[PDB]
Scaffold this active site. Sequence first.
Site, mmCIF file in Angstrom:
data_model
loop_
_atom_site.group_PDB
_atom_site.id
_atom_site.type_symbol
_atom_site.label_atom_id
_atom_site.label_comp_id
_atom_site.label_asym_id
_atom_site.label_seq_id
_atom_site.Cartn_x
_atom_site.Cartn_y
_atom_site.Cartn_z
ATOM 1 N N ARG C 10 0.809 -1.227 0.000
ATOM 2 C CA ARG C 10 0.000 0.000 0.000
ATOM 3 C C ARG C 10 0.840 1.273 0.000
ATOM 4 O O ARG C 10 0.288 2.356 -0.152
ATOM 5 N N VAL C 11 2.163 1.166 0.123
ATOM 6 C CA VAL C 11 3.093 2.220 -0.320
ATOM 7 C C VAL C 11 3.247 2.151 -1.844
ATOM 8 O O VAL C 11 3.096 3.160 -2.531
#
Lengths: 279, 114, 91
Positions: C10-11
């Site tokens: 999710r980065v």
Amino acid sequence: TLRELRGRIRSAGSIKKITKAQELIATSRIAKAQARVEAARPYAAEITNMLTELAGASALDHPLLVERKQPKRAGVLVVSSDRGLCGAYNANVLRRAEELFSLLRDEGKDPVLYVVGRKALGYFSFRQRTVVESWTGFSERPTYENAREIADTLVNAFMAGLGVDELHIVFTEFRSMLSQTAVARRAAPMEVEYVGEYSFEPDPETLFDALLPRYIATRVYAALLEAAASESASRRRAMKSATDNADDLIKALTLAANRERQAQITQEISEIVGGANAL
Amino acid sequence: PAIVGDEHYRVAQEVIRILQRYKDLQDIIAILGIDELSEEDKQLVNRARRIERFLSQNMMAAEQFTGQPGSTVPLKETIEAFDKLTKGEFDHLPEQAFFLIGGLDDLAKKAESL
Amino acid sequence: AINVGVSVSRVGGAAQIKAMKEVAGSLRLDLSQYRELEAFAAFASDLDAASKAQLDRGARLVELLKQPQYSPLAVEEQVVAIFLGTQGHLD
């Protein structure tokens, strides 16, 4: 709640027994059907040898070897299963049948439709096209006495030119136990293929004209035996698939029923001990 | 229908009825696949699986992960799209076309490439 | 044994070097669509030459991604290892 999951596990544990049984049965019936194909083959190889040797002496002017001047209306035979559980078999047949109807209407002809098997009869009674005639109750074990009636009807419909200008068959070719496909081919009028180089009683023209309807009856018979061997091989595959889907379902339901056992016990212990500590 | 109007509400009830009938059949679909079903059910499941996928959208937030740009669609185009899907005007397109689209013109543009 | 459908970052591609981001950037979706195509084709009665080529590429990408214990690869070697698969040199 746990009782619903114990019910669904009881249910799925029965289905897994019934589908594993029909995978093993279909694994025997494809051996009976291949034995019948290989037993029917010697007749058709000899009728082809005899038909080519008669065509060599004949004028080649029989109705089934000559195209109409302006065709409008083409006959098609679809063949299909009398049972369910086949998986893709009836869909593959009926998608090819519609792909063929969209070829014929793209040349400019309209199809008239003859049906073998209760499943295609159910499909072409949900979609609103008529069926000219149909036959049921033998796709699991065809006998030549049925192929006779199908060939007589089709050939009498071609020779009437109500009537038709062509004949097609849609069926599945068994290639091997792991692979098969729906195929559509023109049965009439027939193409004549010249290639590089007898008494007849009473004449070659007379025998050729009396033999071609019997060749058409043996070719539709050979297609019905390929259709029945292929149905059983598609049933075997679809039933192995249904057994492995049921085994993954019993696993997932069991991994849910255990999480609910553990939660139920822990909630019961929390409720007992909270009462014992209040006192 | 008093707050959103009938032409919205009828579409929203028709989509729910289809996804419900599919969510009831999920117990059979999980074992026997699609091919066991009756034609009145197999017709419905073949548009349920398209409606289910066509509720997906490529959001402006997800651009930083997928690299695809985002999409906005107006309400009138949403209602006109799901009205056509439930009536059947897109039943012949493959399920894989319907993922992450946006609107009807983008549906057409994507379906032309497959 | 990385599950390539359920794993996520999710980065994401804010922290991945431009070489790797360019070469590998398609591989995730190519392996996810291979995994569903393999779940279908396990029971497919006939197969098309496009799906048969994609399915064979997917199988050679899954054989490409595995590696033995205690063998870390530098990024300058990882990018070339993924280049062989994604550019089709393993075909």
